[PDB]
Amino acid sequence: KVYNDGYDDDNYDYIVKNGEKWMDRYEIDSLIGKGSFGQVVKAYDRVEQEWVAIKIIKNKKAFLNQAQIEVRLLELMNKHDTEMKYYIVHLKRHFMFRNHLCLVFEMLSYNLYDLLRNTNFRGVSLNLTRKFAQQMCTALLFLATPELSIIHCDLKPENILLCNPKRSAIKIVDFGSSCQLGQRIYQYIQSRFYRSPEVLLGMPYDLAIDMWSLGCILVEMHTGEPLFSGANEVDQMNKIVEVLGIPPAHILDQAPKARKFFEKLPDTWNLKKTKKREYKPPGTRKLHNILGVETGGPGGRRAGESGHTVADYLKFKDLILRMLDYDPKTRIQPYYALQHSFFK
């Protein structure tokens, strides 16, 4: 029938007309994509003479309310990144249009998944991975600023955009799930391949969840493939234990959902019983071999390549293991990740 005077559809989304003009300023160009929040469109800002992406939030109070929480987090980040030096796509503007909240951002055309797919999932060089890693840690250092204390909650290759597909500069998007430390609201957060063990275990979480995601992402960037590609939460936890072993007892003893994955023995914790191909035993799928530390890197493609010496790979493996620490209190933090020897 009639939704929002004919401007909306049955799913509370604005019906995008390729070419429409808004407020004598924005010329809608095309739909970029859809999400649970609403839609993203490409548009030309005629006043500032530049391409933008506009997040059109659903015309429904629950989604309006989450987006208003995010506008407040974005404005707070603007109050502390005047120089736009940290690698975040900042909010340019917010306004209401025909009962939709709209968020304006700089338009970037390619994300990190696009780069991987272009290499046919062979992975980017360790030198490029090093540069991306340095920028991501800087962005996380910025979010860890005391006044901010923002948890991103959805770091994944698709949410890291390329400033120019041949440049090394990146910028983070999508604070739709983010929250400040203390104001946590949701339990089912993070993309599954990049979901930290504390979220899988239903424990309280903090900014360390973003550093876990970063470790997974960096490994995928250089190998071409997701490190932990679980199809559901039990499969995700087991793939993590394949590489990292059983989580420390002092974590599982306080983990609300420890018994979804593990069994406490009369002695200690072990995995739950299976019926019949057992996953590789805990800790036996070594990062050392996933990265090909001594065999010319992933697929052996990096033999004799500068920046891919055995020493470089051992430094990279060491940083990744600090990022994939089961303990969110001892998991490496952004400032100290930046002083790691992987970055010289």
Ligand SMILES: C[C@@H]1O[C@@H](OC[C@H]2O[C@@H](Oc3c(-c4ccc(O)c(O)c4)oc4cc(O)cc(O)c4c3=O)[C@H](O)[C@@H](O)[C@@H]2O)[C@H](O)[C@H](O)[C@H]1O
């Ligand atoms: C490069 C883009 O990558 C992917 O989108 C990236 C992410 O964009 C987010 O869209 C957003 C973009 C964004 C900025 C520039 C763009 O050119 C663009 O298309 C989108 O920037 C933000 C910046 C913030 O500070 C906070 C945010 O919440 C967002 C945001 O949600 C979506 O919410 C996510 O669902 C999506 O994953 C898609 O493949 C898309 O089609 C493609 O164009």
